[PDB]
Structure formats: structure tokens, C-alpha cells
């Protein structure tokens, strides 16, 4: 894993790697787990919590803005650490941004709330709708 290492470090790295038979950490699991893979829940475990949905919703990292000339991640502008937000060079045109994580599954009913803190700086955009 690094220049100027030893065979002991090599076998240690191979041991640290997790194969098919080896366990898999449940620490983070970024992304979103589908519904059809959840066979049985727990009624006792059911309770009243409303968590966030999107991953990297605060734009504090490089994810969800990858391969986009219009929008890029910024590590110096942001209210929360590491002060990361989205930057766009609006050259008189239309700009679009989508969530890096895949589809959020919603169904009929099941009301949703959407919020975000936006700030336009140096807006030369025409005063209109």
C-alpha cells in the first residue's frame, strides 16, 4: 500500500481487506437501502423519528457535484464545516443540479418537507420570474 514497505505490511494489508466470506462493516453504508431488501421489521423498534434523506445534502464534500462544468464543490464557502457549498458560473444560461445519491422512494400520501439555505452573490441575473 505504500512505497518502501515490507512483506509484513503486504500481508497485513491483504488481511485488512475484506473478502466475500469475511464480515462487512455496518458503520456508515452511504447511499440508500431499497425497500424490497427489508424482509421483516420490528414493531417494538418502531418509534417517532424524522431523519434526513439525501446523502451529502449539505454539499460539504465532493460527492453529488461530480463531473459538472456548471457546478463545482467549494471548500471555502459554507456555514458548516468544512465550509463546503456549490459554486456556479452563470453565463446567461440555465443551470441544473441533481442529488448524487440515487432515487428517494416516495409513495402516495407520505407528506414531505423541503428546505435549503440559498444565497446569490454578484447576481447579474435579470430581474424577473
Amino acid at each position: 500500500g505504500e512505497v518502501g514497505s515490507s512483506l509484513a505490511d503486504a500481508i497485513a494489508k491483504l488481511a485488512t481487506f475484506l473478502t466475500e466470506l469475511s464480515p462487512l462493516n455496518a458503520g456508515m453504508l452511504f447511499g440508500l437501502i431499497g425497500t424490497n431488501h427489508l424482509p421483516l421489521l420490528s414493531v417494538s423498534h418502531i418509534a417517532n423519528i424524522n431523519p434526513e434523506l439525501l446523502v451529502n445534502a449539505g454539499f460539504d464534500s465532493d460527492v453529488s457535484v461530480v463531473d459538472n462544468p456548471y457546478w463545482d464543490w467549494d471548500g471555502t464557502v459554507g456555514r458548516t464545516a468544512p465550509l463546503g457549498a456549490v459554486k456556479v458560473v452563470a453565463d446567461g444560461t440555465i443551470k441544473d443540479l441533481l442529488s448524487g445519491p440515487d432515487a428517494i422512494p416516495v409513495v402516495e400520501g407520505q407528506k414531505l418537507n423541503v428546505s435549503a439555505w440559498l444565497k446569490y452573490s454578484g447576481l447579474v441575473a435579470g430581474a424577473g420570474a
Binding site: 439525501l54 441544473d96 443540479l97 441533481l98 444565497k119 420570474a129
Partner: peptide
């Protein structure tokens, strides 16, 4: 299926827009 669309329309002509603390919650 649902995604968060963030669209600055075409009639815009300049500026830089920043977003933070996005929260879409069921």
C-alpha cells in the same frame, strides 16, 4: 422515485448561487 432538482432558469444572466443545509424529510 424522487430526486431534489435545483434549477436556475434560463432567463438568468449572471451571479453565483450557493446552497447549504439541504433537507428533504419525509
Amino acid at each position: 422515485q424522487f430526486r431534489l432538482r435545483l434549477s436556475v432558469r434560463e432567463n438568468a444572466t449572471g451571479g453565483t448561487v450557493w446552497f447549504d443545509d439541504c433537507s428533504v424529510k419525509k
